[PDB]
Amino acid sequence: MKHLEEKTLSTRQIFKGRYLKIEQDQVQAPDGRTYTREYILHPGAAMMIPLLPNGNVVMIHQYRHAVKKVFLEFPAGKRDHNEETLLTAKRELLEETGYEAKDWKFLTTIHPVIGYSNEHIDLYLARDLTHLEQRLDQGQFIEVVEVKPADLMQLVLEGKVSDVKTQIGAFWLDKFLRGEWN
Amino acid sequence: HLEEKTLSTRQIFKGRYLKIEQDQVQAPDGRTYTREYILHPGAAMMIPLLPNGNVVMIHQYRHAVKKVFLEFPAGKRDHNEETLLTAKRELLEETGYEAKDWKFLTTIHPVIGYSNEHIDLYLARDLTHLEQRLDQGQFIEVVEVKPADLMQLVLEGKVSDVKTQIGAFWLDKFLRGEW
Ligand SMILES: Nc1ncnc2c1ncn2[C@@H]1O[C@H](COP(=O)(O)OP(=O)(O)OC[C@H]2O[C@@H](O)[C@H](O)[C@@H]2O)[C@@H](O)[C@H]1O
Ligand SMILES: Nc1ncnc2c1ncn2[C@@H]1O[C@H](COP(=O)(O)OP(=O)(O)OC[C@H]2O[C@@H](O)[C@H](O)[C@@H]2O)[C@@H](O)[C@H]1O
């Protein structure tokens, strides 16, 4: 697929807001011509599917101003300082929900916005959980809930799990639970 | 309860393609925070199912991530048109197909932390193969993929595009009679 590649002729950071950083590149496309590409520079993230002994999964409810709504999500956060994402996932599970896990399994890496961000999210399965306490960050508001996976899958079908990272977790979990993928 | 209340709004950036909104909001702690996110018109993605049971997919380079992706065809809403019109036009332009049977599946939000983007996913059936009509700076190859192969590619980490991976899973439930 080499003949679809675009070659970067220049890059600059075009904007830095309070949170978002934008890179503007000029690229040479397969027609030999020059096009502008803009995208967000993102450190990456981790998300985890925390499977409780009773077979429910620990999830959160969190308001997302970008969309003006509350979402049901699996816990997640940004990579800090180029850390291994396993450390991200561990830290975020403890902070957002109060849990630790003895068994961590990497499932897959996803890209949520290939059109305009370099973000990748590493998705983990966390098992053999024990509870401590929630440690929420400044400006983070999050209610923790337990969800039966069968109810989750029905929520997906019904359009109530629109958060792509979480919906994808749900489908991988479904695969794991029916024993098709391990 | 969890809702944040908008106190002020500003469009802080508009480049060649991206537009960023910056809001001051009041959160449940009563405190003021900044929220910044891309303003995106919305998009449609199309799962085009062929009489032979394969699906039409595309390879496209994505500079944000610096590699070529396997994707279902997709594009952005033009002028707040109905996303089914977006879907019909992009399927024609990206792949050269038209479909006489369209079904909305679901709406996904690919980046709830920093974009208002939504993508509406559709199933397209009863197809006729015309020719592509690509936009400028748009370079795309069309491939047929067997859904069983597509699911193995998902397992292997080779369909990392969230919208397409989600399409694959919905196709799987449909094809298995589950949904
Ligand atoms: N980040 C970008 N920077 C510069 N130009 C872009 C970018 N993304 C797209 N373009 C250009 O703008 C046009 C609009 O593209 P569409 O087909 O409407 O949308 P596409 O880029 O396919 O994305 C639609 C959807 O797919 C998703 O994975 C993507 O994140 C978006 O949600 C194209 O001709 C393309 O060359
Ligand atoms: N658009 C935004 N504007 C301002 N502040 C933000 C924004 N998004 C997040 N924050 C805040 O900055 C901190 C960064 O949190 P993250 O570790 O990014 O947690 P989250 O926002 O969940 O991001 C993890 C991931 O989840 C995805 O769905 C999301 O799009 C991102 O990839 C949090 O305290 C959060 O409240």
Short mmCIF file of C-alpha atoms and ligand atoms in Angstrom, two decimals:
data_model
loop_
_atom_site.label_atom_id
_atom_site.label_comp_id
_atom_site.label_asym_id
_atom_site.label_seq_id
_atom_site.Cartn_x
_atom_site.Cartn_y
_atom_site.Cartn_z
CA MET A 1 0.00 0.00 0.00
CA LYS A 2 3.13 2.23 -0.36
CA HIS A 3 1.53 4.04 -3.36
CA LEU A 4 -1.19 5.60 -1.07
CA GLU A 5 1.38 7.26 1.19
CA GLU A 6 1.71 10.98 1.69
CA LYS A 7 5.19 12.44 2.40
CA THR A 8 5.50 15.24 5.01
CA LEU A 9 7.15 18.37 3.52
CA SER A 10 6.76 20.56 6.62
CA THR A 11 5.15 20.66 10.07
CA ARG A 12 4.51 23.35 12.56
CA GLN A 13 2.44 23.64 15.72
CA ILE A 14 -0.30 26.03 14.56
CA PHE A 15 -2.29 26.38 17.76
CA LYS A 16 -2.10 25.67 21.41
CA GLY A 17 -5.16 26.27 23.52
CA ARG A 18 -5.75 25.54 27.15
CA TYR A 19 -5.79 21.86 26.25
CA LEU A 20 -5.67 21.20 22.54
CA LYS A 21 -2.56 21.35 20.44
CA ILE A 22 -2.87 21.47 16.64
CA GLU A 23 -0.20 20.53 14.10
CA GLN A 24 -0.46 21.83 10.50
CA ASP A 25 1.55 19.85 7.91
CA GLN A 26 2.10 20.22 4.23
CA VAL A 27 2.27 16.85 2.55
CA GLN A 28 3.12 15.51 -0.87
CA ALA A 29 0.38 13.25 -2.06
CA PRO A 30 0.50 10.42 -4.70
CA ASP A 31 -0.30 12.98 -7.43
CA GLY A 32 3.03 14.77 -6.63
CA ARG A 33 1.02 17.77 -5.32
CA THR A 34 1.00 19.52 -1.93
CA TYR A 35 -1.91 19.44 0.51
CA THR A 36 -2.41 20.80 4.02
CA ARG A 37 -3.30 18.32 6.81
CA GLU A 38 -4.34 19.49 10.36
CA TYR A 39 -4.63 17.27 13.37
CA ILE A 40 -4.48 17.14 17.13
CA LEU A 41 -1.35 16.01 18.92
CA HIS A 42 -2.48 13.69 21.69
CA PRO A 43 -0.28 11.66 24.09
CA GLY A 44 -2.37 8.48 23.77
CA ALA A 45 -4.55 6.84 26.37
CA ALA A 46 -5.59 3.68 28.12
CA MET A 47 -9.08 2.25 28.83
CA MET A 48 -9.94 -0.86 30.84
CA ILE A 49 -12.73 -3.36 31.17
CA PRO A 50 -12.82 -4.24 34.90
CA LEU A 51 -14.57 -7.60 35.37
CA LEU A 52 -15.85 -8.22 38.86
CA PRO A 53 -16.13 -11.62 40.61
CA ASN A 54 -19.92 -11.43 40.30
CA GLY A 55 -19.43 -11.08 36.55
CA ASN A 56 -20.60 -7.45 36.35
CA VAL A 57 -18.17 -4.86 34.93
CA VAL A 58 -17.29 -1.64 36.69
CA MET A 59 -18.31 1.38 34.55
CA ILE A 60 -18.72 5.11 35.05
CA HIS A 61 -21.17 7.86 34.30
CA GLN A 62 -19.40 11.05 33.26
CA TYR A 63 -20.67 14.33 31.70
CA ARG A 64 -18.91 15.24 28.38
CA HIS A 65 -19.30 18.89 27.59
CA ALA A 66 -18.15 18.43 23.98
CA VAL A 67 -21.41 16.54 23.35
CA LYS A 68 -23.58 18.07 26.07
CA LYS A 69 -24.45 14.71 27.63
CA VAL A 70 -23.73 12.09 30.27
CA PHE A 71 -22.12 8.93 28.88
CA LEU A 72 -21.69 5.43 30.18
CA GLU A 73 -18.01 4.69 29.85
CA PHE A 74 -15.32 2.23 30.84
CA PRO A 75 -12.63 4.01 32.91
CA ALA A 76 -9.89 5.69 30.90
CA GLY A 77 -7.21 8.43 30.90
CA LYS A 78 -4.29 10.01 29.03
CA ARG A 79 -0.79 8.65 28.97
CA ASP A 80 1.43 10.82 31.18
CA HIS A 81 5.12 11.44 30.40
CA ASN A 82 5.32 8.66 27.77
CA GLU A 83 4.65 5.97 30.47
CA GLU A 84 3.71 2.40 29.55
CA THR A 85 -0.11 2.46 29.06
CA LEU A 86 -0.45 -0.47 31.57
CA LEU A 87 0.59 2.05 34.22
CA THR A 88 -1.99 4.52 32.91
CA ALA A 89 -4.71 1.89 33.06
CA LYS A 90 -3.74 0.88 36.61
CA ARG A 91 -3.58 4.46 37.87
CA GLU A 92 -6.91 5.38 36.23
CA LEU A 93 -8.79 2.34 37.44
CA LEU A 94 -7.68 3.24 41.01
CA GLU A 95 -8.39 6.96 40.71
CA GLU A 96 -11.70 6.85 38.80
CA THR A 97 -13.25 3.82 40.49
CA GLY A 98 -11.19 2.82 43.52
CA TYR A 99 -10.21 -0.61 42.12
CA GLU A 100 -6.98 -2.60 41.65
CA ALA A 101 -6.57 -5.77 39.69
CA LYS A 102 -4.12 -8.64 39.83
CA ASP A 103 -4.72 -9.78 36.27
CA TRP A 104 -4.13 -7.32 33.41
CA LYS A 105 -4.44 -8.38 29.75
CA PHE A 106 -3.79 -6.12 26.77
CA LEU A 107 -6.55 -6.53 24.19
CA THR A 108 -6.01 -4.14 21.28
CA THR A 109 -5.07 -0.64 20.24
CA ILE A 110 -7.71 1.61 18.64
CA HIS A 111 -7.53 5.01 16.88
CA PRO A 112 -10.68 7.11 17.52
CA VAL A 113 -10.22 9.95 15.10
CA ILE A 114 -7.93 8.93 12.30
CA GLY A 115 -9.15 11.93 10.30
CA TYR A 116 -7.80 14.55 12.72
CA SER A 117 -5.96 13.26 15.75
CA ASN A 118 -2.98 10.99 16.33
CA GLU A 119 -4.67 9.64 19.46
CA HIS A 120 -4.42 5.90 20.11
CA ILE A 121 -6.14 4.13 23.03
CA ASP A 122 -4.84 0.86 24.46
CA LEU A 123 -7.69 -1.32 25.75
CA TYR A 124 -7.06 -3.72 28.66
CA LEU A 125 -9.05 -6.43 30.45
CA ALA A 126 -8.67 -6.22 34.23
CA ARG A 127 -9.62 -9.25 36.37
CA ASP A 128 -9.30 -10.35 39.98
CA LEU A 129 -10.34 -7.05 41.42
CA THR A 130 -10.29 -5.67 44.96
CA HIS A 131 -11.75 -2.33 46.04
CA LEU A 132 -10.16 0.62 47.90
CA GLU A 133 -11.40 4.22 47.38
CA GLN A 134 -11.98 6.71 44.57
CA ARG A 135 -9.41 9.52 44.11
CA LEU A 136 -10.92 11.99 41.60
CA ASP A 137 -8.84 14.67 39.93
CA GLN A 138 -9.62 18.43 40.08
CA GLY A 139 -12.52 19.07 37.67
CA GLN A 140 -13.37 15.38 37.27
CA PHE A 141 -16.88 14.22 38.17
CA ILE A 142 -17.71 10.56 37.89
CA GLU A 143 -20.28 8.19 39.36
CA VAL A 144 -19.19 4.51 39.47
CA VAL A 145 -21.76 1.78 38.45
CA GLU A 146 -21.90 -2.00 38.02
CA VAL A 147 -23.25 -3.25 34.78
CA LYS A 148 -24.26 -6.81 33.80
CA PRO A 149 -22.64 -7.51 30.41
CA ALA A 150 -25.97 -8.75 28.93
CA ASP A 151 -27.55 -5.39 29.86
CA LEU A 152 -24.52 -3.60 28.35
CA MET A 153 -24.90 -5.37 25.01
CA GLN A 154 -28.59 -4.46 24.93
CA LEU A 155 -27.65 -0.82 25.70
CA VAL A 156 -25.19 -0.92 22.70
CA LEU A 157 -27.95 -2.17 20.32
CA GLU A 158 -30.27 0.56 21.65
CA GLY A 159 -27.72 3.32 20.82
CA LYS A 160 -27.08 4.20 24.49
CA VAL A 161 -23.38 3.37 24.43
CA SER A 162 -22.35 5.81 21.77
CA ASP A 163 -18.83 6.32 23.25
CA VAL A 164 -16.72 4.42 20.71
CA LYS A 165 -14.02 3.26 23.13
CA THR A 166 -16.61 1.83 25.54
CA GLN A 167 -18.79 0.31 22.77
CA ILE A 168 -15.70 -1.41 21.41
CA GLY A 169 -14.85 -2.66 24.92
CA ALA A 170 -18.31 -4.10 25.11
CA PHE A 171 -17.94 -6.09 21.90
CA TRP A 172 -14.50 -7.46 22.88
CA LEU A 173 -15.88 -8.36 26.31
CA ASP A 174 -18.82 -10.12 24.61
CA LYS A 175 -16.29 -12.10 22.55
CA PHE A 176 -14.26 -13.01 25.64
CA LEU A 177 -17.37 -13.99 27.61
CA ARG A 178 -18.78 -16.28 24.87
CA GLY A 179 -15.30 -17.77 24.56
CA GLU A 180 -14.70 -16.92 20.86
CA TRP A 181 -11.61 -14.82 21.54
CA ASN A 182 -8.85 -15.47 24.16
CA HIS B 1 -26.31 16.37 38.87
CA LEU B 2 -23.21 15.81 36.68
CA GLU B 3 -24.17 18.37 34.08
CA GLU B 4 -21.88 21.36 33.54
CA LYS B 5 -23.50 24.70 32.78
CA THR B 6 -22.12 26.93 30.00
CA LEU B 7 -21.21 30.40 31.17
CA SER B 8 -19.51 31.60 28.01
CA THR B 9 -18.45 30.33 24.58
CA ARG B 10 -15.80 31.44 22.08
CA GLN B 11 -14.44 30.07 18.82
CA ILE B 12 -10.75 30.29 19.62
CA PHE B 13 -9.28 28.66 16.53
CA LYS B 14 -10.20 28.08 12.95
CA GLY B 15 -7.46 26.77 10.71
CA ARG B 16 -7.72 25.33 7.19
CA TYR B 17 -9.83 22.43 8.37
CA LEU B 18 -10.26 22.39 12.17
CA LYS B 19 -12.35 24.68 14.37
CA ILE B 20 -12.08 24.74 18.17
CA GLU B 21 -14.66 26.00 20.57
CA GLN B 22 -13.61 27.08 24.10
CA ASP B 23 -16.21 27.30 26.82
CA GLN B 24 -16.20 28.40 30.44
CA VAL B 25 -18.53 26.07 32.30
CA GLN B 26 -19.71 25.74 35.91
CA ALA B 27 -19.26 22.18 37.20
CA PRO B 28 -21.05 20.29 40.03
CA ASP B 29 -18.45 21.53 42.55
CA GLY B 30 -19.74 25.04 41.77
CA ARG B 31 -16.34 25.88 40.22
CA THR B 32 -15.45 27.31 36.75
CA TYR B 33 -13.50 25.21 34.23
CA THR B 34 -12.40 25.52 30.65
CA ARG B 35 -13.67 23.08 28.05
CA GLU B 36 -12.18 22.96 24.52
CA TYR B 37 -13.41 20.80 21.70
CA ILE B 38 -13.53 20.51 17.93
CA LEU B 39 -16.66 21.73 16.24
CA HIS B 40 -17.40 19.07 13.62
CA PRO B 41 -20.37 18.92 11.26
CA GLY B 42 -21.01 15.18 11.82
CA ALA B 43 -20.47 12.32 9.40
CA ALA B 44 -21.89 9.14 7.94
CA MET B 45 -20.28 5.73 7.42
CA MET B 46 -21.68 2.98 5.16
CA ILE B 47 -21.38 -0.81 5.27
CA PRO B 48 -22.01 -1.88 1.67
CA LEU B 49 -23.09 -5.51 1.51
CA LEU B 50 -22.71 -7.25 -1.85
CA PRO B 51 -24.81 -10.10 -3.30
CA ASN B 52 -21.81 -12.42 -2.88
CA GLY B 53 -21.84 -11.71 0.88
CA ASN B 54 -18.64 -9.66 0.92
CA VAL B 55 -18.49 -5.95 1.86
CA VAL B 56 -17.00 -3.09 -0.01
CA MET B 57 -14.23 -1.45 1.97
CA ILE B 58 -11.45 1.05 1.24
CA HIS B 59 -7.70 1.55 1.88
CA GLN B 60 -6.83 5.17 2.61
CA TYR B 61 -3.76 6.82 4.02
CA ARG B 62 -4.36 8.89 7.15
CA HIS B 63 -1.66 11.39 7.82
CA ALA B 64 -2.77 12.17 11.41
CA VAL B 65 -1.64 8.65 12.31
CA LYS B 66 0.90 8.12 9.47
CA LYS B 67 -0.40 4.91 7.99
CA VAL B 68 -2.92 3.32 5.68
CA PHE B 69 -6.20 2.15 7.16
CA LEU B 70 -8.79 -0.39 6.24
CA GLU B 71 -12.10 1.56 6.46
CA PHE B 72 -15.68 1.43 5.57
CA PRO B 73 -16.41 4.41 3.33
CA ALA B 74 -17.39 7.62 5.10
CA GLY B 75 -17.61 11.38 4.96
CA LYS B 76 -18.67 14.68 6.53
CA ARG B 77 -22.10 16.22 6.56
CA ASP B 78 -22.40 19.03 4.06
CA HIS B 79 -24.63 21.99 4.93
CA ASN B 80 -26.53 20.18 7.72
CA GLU B 81 -28.00 17.87 5.08
CA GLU B 82 -29.70 14.66 6.35
CA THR B 83 -26.78 12.10 6.98
CA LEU B 84 -28.45 9.56 4.70
CA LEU B 85 -27.72 11.97 1.81
CA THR B 86 -24.15 12.21 2.97
CA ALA B 87 -23.95 8.42 2.94
CA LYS B 88 -25.36 8.02 -0.56
CA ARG B 89 -23.01 10.67 -1.98
CA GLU B 90 -19.84 9.38 -0.25
CA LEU B 91 -20.55 5.80 -1.17
CA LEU B 92 -20.78 6.90 -4.82
CA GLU B 93 -17.80 9.19 -4.66
CA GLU B 94 -15.46 6.94 -2.59
CA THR B 95 -16.28 3.54 -4.02
CA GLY B 96 -18.46 4.03 -7.15
CA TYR B 97 -21.43 2.14 -5.71
CA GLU B 98 -25.11 3.03 -5.31
CA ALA B 99 -27.54 1.11 -3.16
CA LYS B 100 -31.33 0.95 -3.34
CA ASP B 101 -31.73 -0.34 0.26
CA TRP B 102 -30.39 1.76 3.19
CA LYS B 103 -30.86 1.12 6.88
CA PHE B 104 -29.68 3.24 9.76
CA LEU B 105 -27.88 1.14 12.41
CA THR B 106 -26.61 3.45 15.16
CA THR B 107 -24.92 6.78 16.07
CA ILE B 108 -21.42 6.79 17.63
CA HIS B 109 -19.30 9.60 19.16
CA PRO B 110 -15.67 8.94 18.42
CA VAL B 111 -14.03 11.49 20.68
CA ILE B 112 -16.31 12.55 23.55
CA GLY B 113 -13.44 14.22 25.38
CA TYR B 114 -12.60 16.83 22.73
CA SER B 115 -15.01 16.76 19.69
CA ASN B 116 -18.75 17.11 19.13
CA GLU B 117 -18.44 14.78 16.19
CA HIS B 118 -21.12 12.13 15.74
CA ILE B 119 -21.04 9.47 13.02
CA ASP B 120 -24.20 7.75 11.81
CA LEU B 121 -23.63 4.22 10.61
CA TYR B 122 -25.74 2.71 7.88
CA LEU B 123 -26.11 -0.65 6.13
CA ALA B 124 -26.32 -0.43 2.33
CA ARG B 125 -27.73 -3.28 0.18
CA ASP B 126 -28.85 -4.09 -3.36
CA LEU B 127 -25.83 -2.47 -4.97
CA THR B 128 -24.93 -1.28 -8.48
CA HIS B 129 -21.27 -0.62 -9.42
CA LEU B 130 -20.70 2.66 -11.22
CA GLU B 131 -17.40 4.55 -10.88
CA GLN B 132 -15.65 6.56 -8.21
CA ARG B 133 -15.71 10.36 -8.25
CA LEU B 134 -13.02 11.27 -5.70
CA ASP B 135 -12.52 14.77 -4.18
CA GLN B 136 -9.24 16.61 -4.30
CA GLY B 137 -6.58 15.37 -1.89
CA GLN B 138 -8.69 12.23 -1.58
CA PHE B 139 -6.82 9.02 -2.57
CA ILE B 140 -8.70 5.76 -2.06
CA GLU B 141 -8.62 2.14 -3.15
CA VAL B 142 -11.67 -0.11 -3.08
CA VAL B 143 -11.44 -3.76 -1.92
CA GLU B 144 -13.98 -6.47 -1.23
CA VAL B 145 -13.60 -8.10 2.12
CA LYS B 146 -15.20 -11.29 3.48
CA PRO B 147 -16.83 -10.54 6.78
CA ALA B 148 -15.23 -13.62 8.37
CA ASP B 149 -11.81 -12.25 7.33
CA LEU B 150 -12.76 -8.79 8.63
CA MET B 151 -13.43 -10.18 12.11
CA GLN B 152 -10.06 -11.98 12.20
CA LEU B 153 -8.40 -8.69 11.14
CA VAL B 154 -10.22 -6.94 14.05
CA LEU B 155 -8.86 -9.64 16.50
CA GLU B 156 -5.39 -9.11 15.17
CA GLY B 157 -5.43 -5.32 15.71
CA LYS B 158 -5.53 -4.51 12.00
CA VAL B 159 -8.87 -2.62 11.99
CA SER B 160 -7.92 0.01 14.54
CA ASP B 161 -10.24 2.65 12.97
CA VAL B 162 -12.98 2.84 15.58
CA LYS B 163 -15.83 3.52 13.16
CA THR B 164 -14.92 0.58 10.89
CA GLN B 165 -14.21 -1.77 13.80
CA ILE B 166 -17.63 -0.89 15.23
CA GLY B 167 -19.17 -1.46 11.75
CA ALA B 168 -17.53 -4.89 11.70
CA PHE B 169 -19.07 -5.85 15.03
CA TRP B 170 -22.56 -4.64 14.05
CA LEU B 171 -22.24 -6.53 10.69
CA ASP B 172 -21.27 -9.64 12.71
CA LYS B 173 -24.42 -9.45 14.88
CA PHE B 174 -26.59 -8.90 11.79
CA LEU B 175 -24.90 -11.70 9.87
CA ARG B 176 -25.16 -14.06 12.85
CA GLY B 177 -28.95 -13.38 13.16
CA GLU B 178 -28.35 -11.99 16.71
CA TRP B 179 -29.35 -8.40 15.72
N1 LIG C 1 -7.27 16.23 9.39
C1 LIG C 1 -7.42 16.73 8.16
N2 LIG C 1 -6.63 17.73 7.75
C2 LIG C 1 -6.75 18.27 6.52
N3 LIG C 1 -7.64 17.86 5.59
C3 LIG C 1 -8.49 16.86 5.89
C4 LIG C 1 -8.44 16.22 7.22
N4 LIG C 1 -9.38 15.26 7.25
C5 LIG C 1 -10.00 15.32 6.03
N5 LIG C 1 -9.45 16.27 5.22
C6 LIG C 1 -9.85 16.64 3.82
O1 LIG C 1 -11.19 17.14 3.90
C7 LIG C 1 -12.07 16.40 3.05
C8 LIG C 1 -13.23 15.86 3.91
O2 LIG C 1 -13.17 14.45 4.18
P1 LIG C 1 -14.50 13.54 4.36
O3 LIG C 1 -14.49 12.33 3.37
O4 LIG C 1 -15.72 14.40 4.48
O5 LIG C 1 -14.21 12.97 5.80
P2 LIG C 1 -13.03 11.89 6.03
O6 LIG C 1 -11.73 12.64 6.29
O7 LIG C 1 -13.25 10.59 5.41
O8 LIG C 1 -13.55 11.67 7.56
C9 LIG C 1 -14.92 11.38 7.90
C10 LIG C 1 -14.86 10.65 9.23
O9 LIG C 1 -14.02 9.49 9.09
C11 LIG C 1 -13.34 9.42 10.38
O10 LIG C 1 -12.46 8.35 10.69
C12 LIG C 1 -12.77 10.84 10.58
O11 LIG C 1 -12.12 11.07 11.89
C13 LIG C 1 -14.16 11.48 10.33
O12 LIG C 1 -14.87 11.23 11.51
C14 LIG C 1 -11.23 15.37 2.28
O13 LIG C 1 -11.18 15.66 0.87
C15 LIG C 1 -9.84 15.44 2.87
O14 LIG C 1 -8.79 15.51 1.87
N1 LIG C 2 -12.01 19.01 26.01
C1 LIG C 2 -11.54 19.28 27.25
N2 LIG C 2 -11.41 20.54 27.69
C2 LIG C 2 -10.93 20.83 28.92
N3 LIG C 2 -10.57 19.90 29.83
C3 LIG C 2 -10.68 18.58 29.53
C4 LIG C 2 -11.18 18.18 28.19
N4 LIG C 2 -11.19 16.82 28.14
C5 LIG C 2 -10.72 16.38 29.35
N5 LIG C 2 -10.42 17.43 30.17
C6 LIG C 2 -9.93 17.35 31.58
O1 LIG C 2 -8.52 17.16 31.61
C7 LIG C 2 -8.22 16.00 32.37
C8 LIG C 2 -7.72 14.98 31.35
O2 LIG C 2 -8.48 13.78 31.47
P1 LIG C 2 -8.15 12.47 30.59
O3 LIG C 2 -7.05 11.70 31.26
O4 LIG C 2 -8.10 12.90 29.13
O5 LIG C 2 -9.55 11.75 30.82
P2 LIG C 2 -10.55 11.74 29.60
O6 LIG C 2 -10.99 13.15 29.23
O7 LIG C 2 -11.48 10.62 29.99
O8 LIG C 2 -9.70 11.24 28.33
C9 LIG C 2 -9.46 9.85 28.09
C10 LIG C 2 -9.99 9.43 26.74
O9 LIG C 2 -11.36 9.10 26.87
C11 LIG C 2 -11.85 9.35 25.52
O10 LIG C 2 -13.22 9.13 25.23
C12 LIG C 2 -11.43 10.80 25.29
O11 LIG C 2 -11.93 11.38 24.01
C13 LIG C 2 -9.95 10.50 25.62
O12 LIG C 2 -9.33 9.76 24.59
C14 LIG C 2 -9.48 15.59 33.16
O13 LIG C 2 -9.53 16.07 34.52
C15 LIG C 2 -10.61 16.21 32.36
O14 LIG C 2 -11.71 16.61 33.22
#
